[PDB]
Ligand code: HEM
Ligand SMILES: O=S(=O)(Nc1ccc(Cc2ccncc2)cc1)c1ccccc1
Ligand SMILES: [Br-]
């Protein structure tokens with residue numbers, strides 16, 4: 221019989237038996253209907269086939285199961301989506317992102333300097349969560365001492381996306397958006413008058429097909445970026461490092477061969493899949509990998525389930541930094557493939573290389589089974605990860 225699960229319930233994703241449920245789905249009903257009838261593509265094949273059919277599986281109903289579309293690229297279909305993405309892409313060209321390497325590395329070393337003399341830290345609180353916020357904060361002009369404020373707003377907003385909020389949490393979300401809107405419109409006005417080299421400046425100057433981003437669009441697209449910058453990467457940093465520490469052979473491999481880091485980052489992404497699902501709305505009735513779907517309903521793409529699909533990944537419950545190929549779907553696939561993927565990979569690489577070399581005997585204090593995952597139906601990962609190491613002096 222099927223697992224009795226609610227794929228819109230954040231408690232499902234905080235369960236370490238979610239992958240057991242996914243396994244049943246992939247073997248018995250690849251396009252699964254949960255206890256409320258919500259449809260979800262669980263196999264790699266079904267996720268890819270849906271991604272490759274955007275006219276049938278649309279983003280224009282919004283990418284959450286019971287929330288409407290907002291006016292940002294991830295809730296748009298081509299051709300409108302393509303224009304918006306080309307405009308925002310000015311901030312994510314390969315050279316611009318790669319040029320951030322020194323500044324990201326300096327943030328990593330500052331963060332490690334803050335804990336390296338202690339011999340213990342909470343890897344989540346002290347390294348994984350602050351780095352992506354500092355990177356995106358610096359892109360958005362956030363003063364270092366205001367990063368925590370933006371982190372709070374981002375947590376509020378991603379909680380809204382990750383549940384069906386009460387009235388008070390709805391109000392908190394709207395308040396956080398109002399504050400973000402105010403800050404960003406102040407930045408836009410300043411940069412339109414006096415451009416710098418930050419993200420709003422680059423986005424204001426972006427022009428495609430004679431078109432430019434309006435103030436309204438700049439607020440919404442930078443919001444999408446902020447909540448990608450500071451609520452996703454953190455979970456791959458923590459969860460991926462956790463697997464290195466749980467499997468000491470993997471830690472040891474990376475420490476003696478830094479050239480294995482690119483493959484290690486890809487396996488951290490496969491394993492952690494911080495984005496647990498994106499929704500698609502059906503534009504027509506269709507028989508999809510054995511399940512009848514109805515026009516107007518939403519289907520989940522279960523990216524973590526796809527990333528553990530034995531049809532594609534041999535021994536998927538084995539964490540193997542050398543996996544080749546490793547064509548995981550943590551960033552999705554197709555027209556909406558994560559625009560920030562290069563920046564996320566760069567953050568992950570730079571922080572992990574420094575953790576390996578500066579905290580070389582890093583160990584978990586407690587085992588995985590007592591480390592909770594955040595209840596959230598959208599983006600999730602570890603709440604806390606106490607680690608110990610031999611102390612060392614800061615770089616400065
Ligand atoms: C490990 C970190 C991240 C993960 C796992 C992740 C995952 C994803 C996924 C699954 C999608 C949708 C793909 C689809 O439906 O096929 C997406 C889209 C997007 N991501 Fe990320 N993301 C991450 C980091 C980032 C960062 C750092 C940024 C910005 C700096 C960012 C910006 C975006 C944008 C703008 C889109 C929308 C693209 C479009 O609709 O065309 N993401 N991301
Ligand atoms: O900005 S949004 O209109 N929509 C939105 C925002 C973030 C994400 C999460 C995400 C982004 C990129 N890579 C991976 C994951 C998805 C969709 C919005 C934000 C907060 C609250 C409601 C809507
Ligand atoms: Br299938």
Ligand SMILES: [Br-]
Nearest residue numbers: 280296297300
């Ligand atoms: Br659209």
Ligand SMILES: [Br-]
Nearest residue numbers: 359417418419
């Ligand atoms: Br920037």
Ligand SMILES: [Cl-]
Nearest residue numbers: 273274275276
């Ligand atoms: Cl199509």
Ligand SMILES: [Cl-]
Nearest residue numbers: 535536537538
């Ligand atoms: Cl396995």
